Amino acid sequence: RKTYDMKSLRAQEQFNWPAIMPIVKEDLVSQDVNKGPWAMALTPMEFARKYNLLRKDDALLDNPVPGEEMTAGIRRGDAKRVFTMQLGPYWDGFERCSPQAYALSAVFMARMNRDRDAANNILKVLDKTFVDGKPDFSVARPVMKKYQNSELVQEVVAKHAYVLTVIASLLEAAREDGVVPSSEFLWLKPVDRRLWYMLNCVGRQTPYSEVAGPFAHWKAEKEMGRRSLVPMIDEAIRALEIAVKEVRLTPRQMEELEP
Amino acid sequence: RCELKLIASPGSWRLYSARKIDERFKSYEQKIFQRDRYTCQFCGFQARLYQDIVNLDGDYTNNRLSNLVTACCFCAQCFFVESVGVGGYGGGTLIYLPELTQAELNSLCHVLFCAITNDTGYKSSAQNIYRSFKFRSQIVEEKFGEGTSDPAIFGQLMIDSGVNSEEIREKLFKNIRLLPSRAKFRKQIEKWAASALEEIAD
Amino acid sequence: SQWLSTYGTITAERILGRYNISLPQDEILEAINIPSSFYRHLLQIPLKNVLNGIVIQQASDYHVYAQKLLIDYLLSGESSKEPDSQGAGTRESLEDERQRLVQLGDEFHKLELEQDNLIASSQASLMKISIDWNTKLETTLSKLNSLYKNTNSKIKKNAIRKALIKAFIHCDLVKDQSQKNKYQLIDKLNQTLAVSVGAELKESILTNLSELFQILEALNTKLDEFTDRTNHLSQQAKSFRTQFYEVILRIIELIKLLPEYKIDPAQDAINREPLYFDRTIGE
Amino acid sequence: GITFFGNDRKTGEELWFANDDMRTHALIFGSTGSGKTETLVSLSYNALVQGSGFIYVDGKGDNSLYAKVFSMVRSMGREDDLLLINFMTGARDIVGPQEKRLSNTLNPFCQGSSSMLTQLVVSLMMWKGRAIAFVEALMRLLVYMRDEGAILLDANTIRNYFDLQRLESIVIDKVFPRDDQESVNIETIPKLVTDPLRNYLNTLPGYNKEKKGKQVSQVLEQHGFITMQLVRSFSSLADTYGHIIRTNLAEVDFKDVVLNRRILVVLLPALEKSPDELSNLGKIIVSSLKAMMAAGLGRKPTNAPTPYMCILDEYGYYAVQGFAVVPAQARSLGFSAIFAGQDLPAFQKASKEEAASIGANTNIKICMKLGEAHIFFKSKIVRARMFYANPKPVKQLKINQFLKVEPPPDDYLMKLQKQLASFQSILESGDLSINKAVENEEITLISKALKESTIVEPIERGVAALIAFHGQN
Amino acid sequence: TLPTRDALLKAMQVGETSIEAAEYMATRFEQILTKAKLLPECNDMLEKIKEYAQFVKFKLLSSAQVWSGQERP
Ligand SMILES: [Zn+2]
């Protein structure tokens, strides 16, 4: 036996725990955030600055709080567009999805019907085949064809409309069989961004800023108890208002934006 | 130069708005605008400000030069009745009248907005027609239930209840027109009026 | 292909219909777009009145919303807040706001009445000039028939009428009126027509077209006076709109601070629905 | 082995530990000059190498620990799994907007499964039992009003309802007052939640059934004597920290954090300087964790393969009754704790009737006598250097903000469901197209004007129809 | 509650110019009166303010072909 460090213990416990296999070869401390494949999620102010939603709120049209000055307001005609676009594709069947979303729904299908060894084996061999070049998801084949037509999975996939919403509700159903942590999708974080934050935001009650459409739609069709093909984002826009009247704007960038 | 069908399609506004920011739809929009002399095919409107290109086959992924046509704000908000009024600018109201096609209603609404906004002595006549248009809007709500006279709620109730067939959709939107509202379209008609009266009288 | 927008097309065609002159078919479209024309100067007077109409429309909608806010106050919140209490600190300033709003209302009605008198006088004078131009055009048309029957180049009546129309549309004699540009329009008519040198015919068409030149020169000074009044009307309209906007902002920032009274967010919505226009519509 | 602790000093070999020994809670004892904080941070790295989000409740007054933990988390890629609530900021200097976001928000009263009764009794600890029955009735009433009424639960509203005349308006005047222009009635509220407050108002000495004016002078001394600790703790929690607690949608709630393996670092300002409110601040966190672990976790979950550790740095100053016990509901969480204190007789100074129980229920003990420590096992004592991880610092310490979404309100979803249930019968019945002919004196005239004209372009035909209509009327 | 006569005359004066404000005055008085007991004295007050709105519509909105060249009387 010998003395250890961060890198030595990480590279020696890489094998017993597969969810640290994508992160063990890189060096993420020296990198900067908001740049690269491994980037932190955006704040609401940085999101509204990136997708160009901001304007100075005119008087007598959207009434400001008298204790609030030198702040910004969001354009609803652009916010509704970007939050509708932040929804995923339609759900029409499990055989028509992304291959990154065909190896997670099989995991939560194995976990929903108490087959945990198969799901843990899928995640382990998937993390190994991701750290070895390009990941293949055909190891998710024999599970998905077995649990596609069970009663609980068909009820959960019938109570929803969109594919991110279906996968988030599948995680919500599968996490009641114990613990399905959100730390085992560090293979999913480089290959997809919207799906990883939709998996990371479910379980919470406050979502991120890159998935507000899918989370508001998930809440709006978990409250009704009905699928809904119309996008229901009418709360989330208002939610962004409550997250954009909080960061104080210096006057140099307050005079810059236009009404 | 086709006719206007009030098409409530569920996955059309997402692809349309996703196209509208990209460069292919923008360069094709400039090509069509130079090809068609900024003329709305649906109602014949003619202006440089706030006009947009729609499809004809419903395919918003595939977009060639032939099927992509140009249209005015009213005839282009007619193609997505499931999200109008909630989509920022642009408004609508469902009315019941069989005497007019949707394109003739859009052309007459352009004429009435030109006679209300930039006044030449015919404000009273256009307001007296627009009154009875709003009264027909009130007539619809007795049949289809209270609250769904606005087109966004009607598109939601349509494509949330599971109808995709052209037969049931054409029998449900029969004898129903989409009158564009003035007070939500004030910025566009005042911009068109100010641009025209500063282009002529300078 | 240098076309005209349909809002301006409807407005221009209907104003030319109000002047009872409907002679050109597509020469209207080639006339009212070019700057060095005559119909553009016959049209440039009431279009500024129409633009002032939309400006006073925005100002009047601001005025209607301010009066609706003060009606919503004055029907309920006058005496439930007695003096020497919480309400009397702002109720007197809201009474001052009521005095300023009724003063602005009387002066804005004075402005609308002066607008109505201006457009009435302008349409009466321009209708007189229009029918005078039509009658003198018929007179000089018969005289041009009698003058061009005996020329060596046989030509019809209507073709030289369209040639005279293109002459008065191509180069202007309404602002730059002098001795040379009249001869320039004469050579433009004789260039639209095939060949005419006319050593006697040139002074003959001078003494015949002197009626049209006199009508145009009488139109020019009246255009100058109408522009001189219309600029002041536009400045008064813009200042009235700005001070109405300040009045509504002060009334709402007063009524936000009242403890036992507040505005209901539904009737305020149905009052605030027609207030979504642009404010920077004047230049 | 699964978890790594240290390497032996004498012969030089490492000493792992197992998950069954780890689920029995550990204990470490070292002074302020022994380097205990870096050892706890290294054990946090040992828990983070296998995907388990440590909860770090620190009360040693360290502002330069968030940089170390953030460098350790960013070193593992799971930067999204981090939440920071900073209780060491200033007092009430956050009003309206803010120049930069300083800390996440935490409100343990909005998503409550009616375990907030137990949460508040262990945040508090026959005047005592009287106050506990009073707050049990109050927590029942406030959770029933949070379930469907327009009242949001936080420290401020309960602090507002700690008075008497509002509660007298609750029970006697049977109306609901708030700090808002509102008049909510109790005539529709059932009897089972309104009776225990009436039974609390019965058992006081001096009561008047008609008015309040005599009984307030009779029983305000007893009311202050039973509610002074609660009103001072809730006044501190609701006035000193208004940007951490007064939210509605809490970014960090302790069921999500232990059920989904997220990392929560909470920093307390001090615990040796003015402990009248700061021990209560730590007790709120440990109380919420204990109440949402023991009695709120809810066909049969399996045991976790990842050991979870809430590394509590000073359990001497904040304390709850029976935190070392873990019920049968929470053994599937893979839960544990690493308690720490300054010195063991100081630990005997620190808590009352508790230092034995935490001494008895925690199996693993570590002694750091002043080369870091030696391990106090059940069988064998071994002198071993602890694990030393030095996280290299980050250029920018950006705390990740969130949104505050809501479900759509019940005044709109009920209307949408009613309109859809009305539209379904219309779409089903087959007689769905409009056929009733209603006519005005206007639409027929404008339709005749559009029909009689023959100009091809529709705009010119429209303006000609408007001309004909104005000429005919 | 019921407003005073001085406040009602101030409401009369504040909407003397615009037609829509006086029509809103009549509609809102009818609304707050059908929320109220609607006494015959309040019916006489409603008749008074309807006479006022009719006088405003009679005196104020008079086109008389102001765009056709015909001036104001
Ligand atoms: Zn059109």
mmCIF file of C-alpha atoms in Angstrom, chain C residues 51-162:
data_model
loop_
_atom_site.group_PDB
_atom_site.id
_atom_site.type_symbol
_atom_site.label_atom_id
_atom_site.label_comp_id
_atom_site.label_asym_id
_atom_site.label_seq_id
_atom_site.Cartn_x
_atom_site.Cartn_y
_atom_site.Cartn_z
ATOM 1 C CA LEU C 51 -50.293 62.296 -39.834
ATOM 2 C CA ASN C 52 -51.314 64.919 -37.270
ATOM 3 C CA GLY C 53 -54.592 63.003 -37.075
ATOM 4 C CA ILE C 54 -52.863 59.807 -35.970
ATOM 5 C CA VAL C 55 -50.699 61.785 -33.518
ATOM 6 C CA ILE C 56 -53.726 63.431 -31.888
ATOM 7 C CA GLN C 57 -55.366 59.993 -31.917
ATOM 8 C CA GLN C 58 -52.550 58.642 -29.722
ATOM 9 C CA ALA C 59 -52.743 61.746 -27.515
ATOM 10 C CA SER C 60 -56.530 61.424 -27.227
ATOM 11 C CA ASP C 61 -56.251 57.770 -26.199
ATOM 12 C CA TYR C 62 -53.797 58.799 -23.469
ATOM 13 C CA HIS C 63 -56.298 61.490 -22.432
ATOM 14 C CA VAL C 64 -59.157 58.962 -22.330
ATOM 15 C CA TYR C 65 -57.125 56.597 -20.138
ATOM 16 C CA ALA C 66 -56.224 59.425 -17.735
ATOM 17 C CA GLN C 67 -59.859 60.510 -17.458
ATOM 18 C CA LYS C 68 -60.931 56.891 -16.900
ATOM 19 C CA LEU C 69 -58.385 56.573 -14.077
ATOM 20 C CA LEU C 70 -59.708 59.748 -12.463
ATOM 21 C CA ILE C 71 -63.312 58.540 -12.851
ATOM 22 C CA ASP C 72 -62.296 55.281 -11.135
ATOM 23 C CA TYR C 73 -60.817 57.342 -8.305
ATOM 24 C CA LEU C 74 -63.596 59.952 -7.939
ATOM 25 C CA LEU C 75 -66.435 57.423 -7.818
ATOM 26 C CA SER C 76 -65.153 55.700 -4.686
ATOM 27 C CA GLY C 77 -62.164 57.215 -2.902
ATOM 28 C CA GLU C 78 -63.065 60.827 -2.117
ATOM 29 C CA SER C 79 -64.270 61.007 1.496
ATOM 30 C CA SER C 80 -63.588 57.563 2.985
ATOM 31 C CA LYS C 81 -60.169 59.039 3.828
ATOM 32 C CA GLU C 82 -61.155 61.985 6.016
ATOM 33 C CA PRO C 83 -58.871 65.022 6.457
ATOM 34 C CA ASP C 84 -56.160 65.094 9.141
ATOM 35 C CA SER C 85 -55.509 61.422 8.363
ATOM 36 C CA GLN C 86 -53.582 59.160 5.993
ATOM 37 C CA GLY C 87 -55.425 60.166 2.821
ATOM 38 C CA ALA C 88 -55.153 63.960 2.915
ATOM 39 C CA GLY C 89 -51.407 63.928 2.226
ATOM 40 C CA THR C 90 -51.993 62.796 -1.367
ATOM 41 C CA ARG C 91 -55.687 63.594 -1.967
ATOM 42 C CA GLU C 92 -54.971 67.324 -2.341
ATOM 43 C CA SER C 93 -52.234 66.614 -4.884
ATOM 44 C CA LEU C 94 -54.676 64.360 -6.727
ATOM 45 C CA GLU C 95 -57.129 67.280 -6.730
ATOM 46 C CA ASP C 96 -54.315 69.331 -8.293
ATOM 47 C CA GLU C 97 -53.925 66.508 -10.839
ATOM 48 C CA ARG C 98 -57.659 66.781 -11.563
ATOM 49 C CA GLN C 99 -57.299 70.527 -12.177
ATOM 50 C CA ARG C 100 -54.371 69.956 -14.548
ATOM 51 C CA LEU C 101 -56.263 67.202 -16.380
ATOM 52 C CA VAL C 102 -59.398 69.283 -16.921
ATOM 53 C CA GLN C 103 -57.249 72.211 -18.127
ATOM 54 C CA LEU C 104 -55.425 69.918 -20.565
ATOM 55 C CA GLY C 105 -58.789 68.522 -21.659
ATOM 56 C CA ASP C 106 -60.159 71.959 -22.533
ATOM 57 C CA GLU C 107 -56.967 72.913 -24.381
ATOM 58 C CA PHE C 108 -56.916 69.568 -26.224
ATOM 59 C CA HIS C 109 -60.505 70.077 -27.364
ATOM 60 C CA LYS C 110 -59.404 73.522 -28.579
ATOM 61 C CA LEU C 111 -56.592 71.781 -30.491
ATOM 62 C CA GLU C 112 -58.999 69.278 -32.079
ATOM 63 C CA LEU C 113 -61.347 72.093 -33.128
ATOM 64 C CA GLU C 114 -58.451 73.987 -34.718
ATOM 65 C CA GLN C 115 -57.462 70.756 -36.515
ATOM 66 C CA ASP C 116 -61.019 70.408 -37.858
ATOM 67 C CA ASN C 117 -61.070 74.029 -39.044
ATOM 68 C CA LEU C 118 -57.674 73.564 -40.731
ATOM 69 C CA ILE C 119 -58.668 70.428 -42.644
ATOM 70 C CA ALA C 120 -61.998 72.025 -43.632
ATOM 71 C CA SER C 121 -60.323 75.154 -45.041
ATOM 72 C CA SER C 122 -57.605 73.086 -46.738
ATOM 73 C CA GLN C 123 -60.061 70.729 -48.435
ATOM 74 C CA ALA C 124 -62.302 73.625 -49.530
ATOM 75 C CA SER C 125 -59.431 75.586 -51.091
ATOM 76 C CA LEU C 126 -57.825 72.537 -52.707
ATOM 77 C CA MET C 127 -61.199 71.401 -54.087
ATOM 78 C CA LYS C 128 -61.615 74.844 -55.664
ATOM 79 C CA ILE C 129 -58.102 74.594 -57.155
ATOM 80 C CA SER C 130 -58.865 71.059 -58.395
ATOM 81 C CA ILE C 131 -62.080 71.979 -60.218
ATOM 82 C CA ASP C 132 -60.388 75.119 -61.591
ATOM 83 C CA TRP C 133 -57.530 72.966 -62.921
ATOM 84 C CA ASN C 134 -60.014 70.530 -64.488
ATOM 85 C CA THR C 135 -62.028 73.268 -66.227
ATOM 86 C CA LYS C 136 -58.902 75.059 -67.461
ATOM 87 C CA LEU C 137 -57.482 71.719 -68.617
ATOM 88 C CA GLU C 138 -60.618 71.177 -70.711
ATOM 89 C CA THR C 139 -60.293 74.725 -72.092
ATOM 90 C CA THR C 140 -56.614 74.317 -73.005
ATOM 91 C CA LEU C 141 -57.456 70.850 -74.360
ATOM 92 C CA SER C 142 -59.928 72.325 -76.858
ATOM 93 C CA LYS C 143 -57.415 75.086 -77.624
ATOM 94 C CA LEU C 144 -54.644 72.513 -78.144
ATOM 95 C CA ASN C 145 -56.948 70.634 -80.524
ATOM 96 C CA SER C 146 -57.522 73.841 -82.503
ATOM 97 C CA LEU C 147 -53.791 74.612 -82.358
ATOM 98 C CA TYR C 148 -52.597 71.139 -83.372
ATOM 99 C CA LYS C 149 -55.136 70.439 -86.114
ATOM 100 C CA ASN C 150 -53.314 72.734 -88.565
ATOM 101 C CA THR C 151 -49.746 71.609 -87.821
ATOM 102 C CA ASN C 152 -47.654 69.765 -90.394
ATOM 103 C CA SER C 153 -47.478 66.658 -88.162
ATOM 104 C CA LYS C 154 -50.990 65.228 -87.913
ATOM 105 C CA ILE C 155 -51.666 63.872 -84.419
ATOM 106 C CA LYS C 156 -54.734 62.965 -82.373
ATOM 107 C CA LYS C 157 -56.237 64.614 -79.284
ATOM 108 C CA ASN C 158 -55.771 62.057 -76.502
ATOM 109 C CA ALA C 159 -52.105 61.255 -77.206
ATOM 110 C CA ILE C 160 -51.028 64.867 -76.762
ATOM 111 C CA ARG C 161 -53.127 64.939 -73.574
ATOM 112 C CA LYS C 162 -51.083 62.051 -72.148
#
